[PDB]
Amino acid sequence: KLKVGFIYIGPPGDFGWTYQHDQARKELVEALGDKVETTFLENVAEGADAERSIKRIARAGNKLIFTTSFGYMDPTVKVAKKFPDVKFEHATGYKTADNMSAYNARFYEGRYVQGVIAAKMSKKGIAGYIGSVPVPEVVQGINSFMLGAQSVNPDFRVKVIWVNSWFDPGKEADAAKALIDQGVDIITQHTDSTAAIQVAHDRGIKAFGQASDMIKFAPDTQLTAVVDEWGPYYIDRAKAVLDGTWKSQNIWWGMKEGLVKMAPFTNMPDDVKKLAEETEARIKSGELNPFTGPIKKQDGSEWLKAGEKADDQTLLGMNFYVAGVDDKLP
Numbered sequence: 001k002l003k004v005g006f007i008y009i010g011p012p013g014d015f016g017w018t019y020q021h022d023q024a025r026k027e028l029v030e031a032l033g034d035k036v037e038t039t040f041l042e043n044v045a046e047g048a049d050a051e052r053s054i055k056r057i058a059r060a061g062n063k064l065i066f067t068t069s070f071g072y073m074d075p076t077v078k079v080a081k082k083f084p085d086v087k088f089e090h091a092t093g094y095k096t097a098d099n100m101s102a103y104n105a106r107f108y109e110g111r112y113v114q115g116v117i118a119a120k121m122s123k124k125g126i127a128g129y130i131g132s133v134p135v136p137e138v139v140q141g142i143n144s145f146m147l148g149a150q151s152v153n154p155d156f157r158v159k160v161i162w163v164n165s166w167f168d169p170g171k172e173a174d175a176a177k178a179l180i181d182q183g184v185d186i187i188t189q190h191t192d193s194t195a196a197i198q199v200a201h202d203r204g205i206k207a208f209g210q211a212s213d214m215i216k217f218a219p220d221t222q223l224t225a226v227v228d229e230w231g232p233y234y235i236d237r238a239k240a241v242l243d244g245t246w247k248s249q250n251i252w253w254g255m256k257e258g259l260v261k262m263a264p265f266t267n268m269p270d271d272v273k274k275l276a277e278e279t280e281a282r283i284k285s286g287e288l289n290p291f292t293g294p295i296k297k298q299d300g301s302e303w304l305k306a307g308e309k310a311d312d313q314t315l316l317g318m319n320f321y322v323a324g325v326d327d328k329l330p
């Protein structure tokens with residue numbers, strides 16, 4: 001059997017980011033169980049822990065290894081050099097090697113839809129945003145969310161609190177409570193766990209799930225969620241290893257390609273659901289790209305001209321906010 005390994009930055013118990021990775025591992029086992037065997041390690045920190053943990057999985061005989069967090073980028077590039085018969089698949093990074101692929105999702109496409117919904121739902125026009133770490137993926141998401149909201153309410157605001165890691169349920173909960181205490185009427189996040197959405201549900205504040213459909217933790221208050229569909233990708237790459245056709249590739253895919261999808265649209269009026277559907281549909285067809293001008297930056301300078309679509313290279317290094325965001329970027 002092909003031994004396939006997984007490194008997670010959190011626990012499957014997060015019921016968000018790591019959980020979606022592990023549910024996709026389970027999809028792999030269900031589709032190719034007779035020919036594949038999976039192993040994982042969880043709560044693996046960036047840096048030395050990641051290097052040792054990736055090396056250990058390779059030394060145990062795993063011939064395809066998925067490193068499922070951005071901070072594993074450099075550790076995966078380093079370790080891959082020492083294991084030429086192993087194939088490595090790094091999540092959300094932009095670095096590849098002869099035996100290392102990079103798989104990224106346009107999560108910001110889902111953020112745009114959520115922003116549209118948020119601007120229709122929030123009576124105050126204010127959302128609480130729980131940031132993880134200020135890497136370009138997160139800045140993209142904040143910016144896209146705001147642009148979506150601003151296509152309904154030009155005056156929409158977000159209040160951002162940084163947790164400073166991907167998974168930290170204590171700080172995620174604290175951030176949600178602080179944002180709700182400060183008067184926001186929508187909660188959203190780029191951290192990994194269900195901590196904030198349960199706080200929001202406990203306070204009757206409507207929210208978006210992250211990575212996974214988190215409806216079970218907020219049945220009457222989740223509006224939708226940006227859902228990461230890793231399973232078909234994991235199956236395809238395992239098949240490619242099994243049949244000997246696996247080759248290094250760098251990909252960045254979104255709704256059109258099926259890597260990102262919205263959860264069902266719940267707890268909102270029918271016209272808001274119709275508009276969410278229409279928005280997702282326009283992104284999925286290629287008609288709507290959230291980062292299409294006119295768009296100005298936080299400091300007032302123009303970014304994109306009327307009708308001008310962003311280059312992906314700009315997004316991948318994104319380190320500025322669009323006009324309307326109040327946060328100072330770390």
Ligand SMILES: Nc1ncnc2[nH]cnc12
Pocket residue numbers: 009017068069070071091092137166190191192
């Ligand atoms: N949303 C996320 N959670 C954890 N690790 C990540 N790496 C990239 N995006 C991530």
Ligand SMILES: [Mg+2]
Pocket residue numbers: 283286287288289
């Ligand atoms: Mg497009």
